[PDB]
Design an enzyme around this catalytic site. Structure first.
Site, PDB file in Angstrom:
ATOM      1  N   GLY A 120      52.305  31.739  86.551  1.00 52.47           N
ATOM      2  CA  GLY A 120      52.338  33.117  85.737  1.00 52.47           C
ATOM      3  C   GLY A 120      54.069  34.007  86.411  1.00 52.47           C
ATOM      4  N   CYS A 121      55.114  33.218  85.937  1.00 50.70           N
ATOM      5  CA  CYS A 121      56.681  32.890  86.295  1.00 50.70           C
ATOM      6  C   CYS A 121      56.864  34.673  86.528  1.00 50.70           C
ATOM      7  CB  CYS A 121      57.384  32.005  85.957  1.00 50.70           C
ATOM      8  SG  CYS A 121      57.120  32.040  83.917  1.00 50.70           S
ATOM      9  N   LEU A 134      52.075  33.931  80.602  1.00 51.03           N
ATOM     10  CA  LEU A 134      50.754  34.610  79.204  1.00 51.03           C
ATOM     11  C   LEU A 134      51.673  35.582  79.057  1.00 51.03           C
ATOM     12  CD1 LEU A 134      47.018  34.355  80.643  1.00 51.03           C
ATOM     13  CD2 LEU A 134      48.253  32.039  78.618  1.00 51.03           C
ATOM     14  N   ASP A 164      44.721  27.077  83.024  1.00 53.04           N
ATOM     15  CA  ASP A 164      43.613  27.040  82.455  1.00 53.04           C
ATOM     16  C   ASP A 164      43.961  25.562  81.905  1.00 53.04           C
ATOM     17  OD1 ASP A 164      43.457  29.321  81.255  1.00 53.04           O
ATOM     18  OD2 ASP A 164      42.139  28.292  80.009  1.00 53.04           O
ATOM     19  N   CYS A 180      49.868  53.395  94.604  1.00 56.19           N
ATOM     20  CA  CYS A 180      50.111  52.416  95.141  1.00 56.19           C
ATOM     21  C   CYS A 180      50.592  52.143  96.446  1.00 56.19           C
ATOM     22  CB  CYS A 180      50.659  51.083  94.209  1.00 56.19           C
ATOM     23  SG  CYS A 180      49.457  51.196  92.398  1.00 56.19           S
TER      24      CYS A 180
END
Length: 274
Positions: free
Chosen positions: A59-60, A82, A111, A256
């Site tokens: 997940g760069c 992705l 995966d 947040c």
């Protein structure tokens, strides 16, 4: 939806490195970009990289992290994301960096990944996972690393109501209102892990947790800045999208921030060894 905005939209509040994760103000006067690179350096130093090794970034994001790796270390690197936005954007940014090593960008999930590496880094991608995959994730991570393999996992963390009560943390109704906003806009069925969860699943795969470093108030400042930027880039954000997505993000960022500031949320870096 807020997931359909462009990379150019994020540029309205992220720093020049396009890091969408917790910054590390190693110095109180650091800038966001300086704090961001600091966070990356912090993570990378923990991996004990030697020349010739291969580094995996799961997940760069938009490549800000793999940039520091190439510049400051003599290693092959592989980043997997992705988001096609990120995939093309990172492949371009990273091609402009000089190097005598291999550099591969892949639009691919963990995966699917099965190549052998020497070190692994993951920053902000874990909170997008479902607790049912945690075990398999660490099983795959552990499987591709070598005997002395090491991995650093950076991820936001949550607390149980017991602990929050134990800490004098009084969750108000507004806080719960914001939680539904999350489960609606951000988390389509997604349980965020607590520190102990990381230990459990990590050690369950036979990893060894050598350190966890928590950066609660860093994210609050990180969030305090992203918000101010988007506010400063208000009119442009609307032009890019709409007042809806704008208010959406502001509420998201500001809420947040309040959670990390009040003590409801946390973010930790877990050093895992094989």
């Amino acid at each position: 939806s807020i997931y359909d905005v462009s990379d150019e939209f994020f540029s309205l509040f992220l720093d020049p490195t396009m890091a969408y994760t917790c910054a590390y103000f190693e110095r109180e006067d650091m800038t966001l970009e300086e704090a961001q690179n600091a966070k990356f350096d912090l993570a990378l130093d923990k991996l004990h990289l030697e020349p010739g090794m291969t580094l995996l970034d799961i997940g760069c994001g938009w490549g800000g992290g793999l940039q520091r790796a190439i510049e400051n270390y003599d290693v092959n690197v592989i980043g997997i994301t992705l988001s096609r936005n990120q995939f093309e954007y990172s492949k371009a940014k990273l091609a402009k960096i000089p190097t005598e090593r291999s550099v591969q960008v892949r639009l691919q999930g963990w995966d699917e990944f099965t190549d052998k590496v020497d070190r692994i880094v993951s920053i902000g991608a874990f909170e997008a996972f479902k607790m049912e995959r945690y075990a398999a994730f660490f099983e795959r991570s552990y499987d591709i690393l070598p005997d002395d393999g090491r991995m650093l996992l950076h991820t936001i963390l949550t607390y149980t109501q017991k602990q929050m009560h134990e800490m004098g943390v009084k969750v108000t109704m507004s806080d719960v209102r914001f939680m539904k906003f999350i489960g609606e806009e951000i988390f389509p069925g997604g349980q965020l892990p607590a520190q102990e969860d990381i230990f459990k699943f990590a050690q369950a795969a036979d990893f060894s947790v050598e350190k966890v470093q928590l950066l609660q108030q860093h994210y609050a400042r990180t969030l305090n800045i992203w918000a101010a930027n988007l506010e400063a880039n208000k009119d442009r954000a609307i032009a890019l999208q709409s007042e809806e997505i704008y208010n959406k993000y502001m509420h998201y960022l500001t809420g947040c921030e309040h959670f990390f500031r009040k003590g409801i949320s946390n973010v930790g870096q877990f050093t895992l060894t094989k």
